Design a protein around this ligand. Sequence first.
Ligand SMILES: NC(=O)c1ccc[n+]([C@@H]2O[C@H](COP(=O)([O-])OP(=O)(O)OC[C@H]3O[C@@H](n4cnc5c(N)ncnc54)[C@H](O)[C@@H]3O)[C@@H](O)[C@H]2O)c1
Ligand SMILES: NC(=O)c1ccc[n+]([C@@H]2O[C@H](COP(=O)([O-])OP(=O)(O)OC[C@H]3O[C@@H](n4cnc5c(N)ncnc54)[C@H](O)[C@@H]3O)[C@@H](O)[C@H]2O)c1
Ligand SMILES: Cc1c(N2CCN(C)CC2)ccc2c3c(c(=O)oc12)CN(C(=O)c1ccc(NS(C)(=O)=O)c(Cl)c1)CC3
Ligand SMILES: Cc1c(N2CCN(C)CC2)ccc2c3c(c(=O)oc12)CN(C(=O)c1ccc(NS(C)(=O)=O)c(Cl)c1)CC3
Lengths: 293, 290
Amino acid sequence: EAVVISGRKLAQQIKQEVRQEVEEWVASGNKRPHLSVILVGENPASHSYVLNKTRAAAVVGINSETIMKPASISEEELLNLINKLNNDDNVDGLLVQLPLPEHIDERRICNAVSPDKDVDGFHVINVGRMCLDQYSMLPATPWGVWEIIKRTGIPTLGKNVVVAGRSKNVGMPIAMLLHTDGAHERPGGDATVTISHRYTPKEQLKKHTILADIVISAAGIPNLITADMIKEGAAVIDVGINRVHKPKLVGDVDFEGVRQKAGYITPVPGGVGPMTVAMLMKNTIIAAKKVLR
Amino acid sequence: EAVVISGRKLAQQIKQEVRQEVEEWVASGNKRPHLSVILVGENPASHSYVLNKTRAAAVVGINSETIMKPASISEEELLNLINKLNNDDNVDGLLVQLPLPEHIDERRICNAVSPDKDVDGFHVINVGRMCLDQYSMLPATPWGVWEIIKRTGIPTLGKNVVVAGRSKNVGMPIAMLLHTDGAHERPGGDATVTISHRYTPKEQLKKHTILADIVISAAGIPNLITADMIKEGAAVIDVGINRVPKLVGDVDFEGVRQKAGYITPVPGGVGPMTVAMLMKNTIIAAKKVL
Ligand SMILES: NC(=O)c1ccc[n+]([C@@H]2O[C@H](COP(=O)([O-])OP(=O)(O)OC[C@H]3O[C@@H](n4cnc5c(N)ncnc54)[C@H](O)[C@@H]3O)[C@@H](O)[C@H]2O)c1
Ligand SMILES: NC(=O)c1ccc[n+]([C@@H]2O[C@H](COP(=O)([O-])OP(=O)(O)OC[C@H]3O[C@@H](n4cnc5c(N)ncnc54)[C@H](O)[C@@H]3O)[C@@H](O)[C@H]2O)c1
Ligand SMILES: Cc1c(N2CCN(C)CC2)ccc2c3c(c(=O)oc12)CN(C(=O)c1ccc(NS(C)(=O)=O)c(Cl)c1)CC3
Ligand SMILES: Cc1c(N2CCN(C)CC2)ccc2c3c(c(=O)oc12)CN(C(=O)c1ccc(NS(C)(=O)=O)c(Cl)c1)CC3
């Protein structure tokens, strides 16, 4: 039966690294790092996430402020805020919680944030750089996924990976990190990767996962992954966060089933979720160092 | 048995489309599209490709000028050339033949060409936009590969694709187009895509290909793909170009030819498509659509 992986524990380790690196930076006599969050409207979940991020900044000694705005705000105004922040030398990282209200174009907002402060890594230049295997502000969730794999010692070079989901913010970047060259400016995983999505037939998913040393699910579909899909010994990383109904939270994996076949697995809750917030703290210290100028 | 797809004829079809689109465009009173090509040094294969480019441009009614330069050119010079051309409102499309010589940072160069004139689609912004399924100047070989698939009518949505190779110019862009959402601003093929590369073991490659309705091969290895890798009735697209003289694909042509439903030859396959799609991109650039 399968080693469960604590993303809670892993994430706290990473936050320890960041805490130290920030104490170092500051005692060297540099300004304390400052993360600015913009939060629009009242998605409950959005609120929760921003709070996750600001707690985390607190515990690692990063200054934060959430600038909160009414859902009624206009795209043009939001660009104005973002522009103030890009220009404020005190602001190191800057991020816009998502999703934004439908009268606001995300892509244009994401491209508004200065790439050097873009701790979500969603700016088109950061996407370009990442897709060219260049140093970039990597997106927190895919980076977290990669850190779970790397820190658990699960090998990837030569191995087969299947990612369910192909979103630009999660699925695609995971697939990008894992298939790319270990030798490149930003090393990849040298895996053989299969991208599946909402039009992969279930028989086809299974036909691929079955061959996989690593399965990574980011579809938002409970029990999308079940033990008959999963090779014996495989690592299974659960990126999904689904609300089932009192109301709880679950992954795209059949946790109970899958841990019978799998060599490793990540719980939801307590897996990838907290890793996301951890890798965001890493990006903030990186941004404060203007290391990737 | 296996339909051979003529890259020559499809490229010819696309050329005719561009030719007509240029006529209308000039007839509307617009400037004639102009393509500038920079050649550095004397790589024979380079010289050859640049000629195929300017020749294509001439048949479709697009003006070309190749600016050939000594291998010894400084990087600061080339960037100065590029900045001039970027600034010349009569140049619609600019492209730098590859490879450059060792003292030249290719990435600094690709990123120096105006994104709006980047007919090769190699600027980081065009790569980014492509990877977000936005409108972009698509790279010519990948777009060529896609066109061979659409125009031949081979289905992709739901279907299983394997790509051999992961280079930023060919393999990766191909994989991007084929797996992404048909509904996005730049539609993709909604297929299930496996990316393989130099650390995929033959074993693993084969277990993936046998499941593939489309195998696309862009690895630069003679006979990488043999009929036992393929599945009866499957589309096999050979992007490879191997100097063994003679020129051969990644695929074993006569071999695969019997099992494949479709196949593309080398020569006369993807290569001509690349030149066609670049004409498509030059007219787009000229129109300043994006
Ligand atoms: N753990 C984290 O920190 C974190 C961060 C972001 C998102 N998520 C979770 O990951 C999931 C996906 O989020 P997102 O924004 O990346 O995705 P999304 O909602 O934008 O899209 C989900 C993707 O899954 C694909 N998909 C749908 N059905 C599928 C199927 N049957 N098989 C394979 N692929 C299928 C779709 O094609 C799409 O690309 C959600 O549960 C989300 O909450 C988790
Ligand atoms: N038809 C055209 O118009 C056109 C255009 C450009 C390139 N090409 C050809 O495509 C091929 C690839 O060249 P390139 O510049 O795209 O890439 P490249 O030469 O830089 O690298 C080839 C790629 O194949 C991968 N690869 C190597 N061995 C492999 C193996 N055993 N199995 C699977 N993948 C493997 C490598 O990891 C690498 O990503 C060459 O034949 C090249 O001449 C054709
Ligand atoms: C915009 C968005 C999502 N969208 C879903 C629909 N899709 C259409 C777009 C993306 C989906 C997920 C997220 C997430 C975050 C975000 O900031 O935005 C998201 C930030 N996160 C967190 O703060 C977090 C979540 C769960 C945690 N714990 S658990 C319960 O053990 O998993 C912990 Cl500790 C932290 C991760 C998830
Ligand atoms: C820089 C580079 C390559 N490098 C390979 C190593 N890699 C490390 C870098 C890329 C590899 C291939 C190309 C190619 C071109 C280019 O402009 O640059 C390349 C342009 N092309 C052509 O003009 C062409 C080729 C073949 C044709 N016909 S055939 C003989 O039936 O195939 C026809 Cl009609 C046209 C495509 C090939």
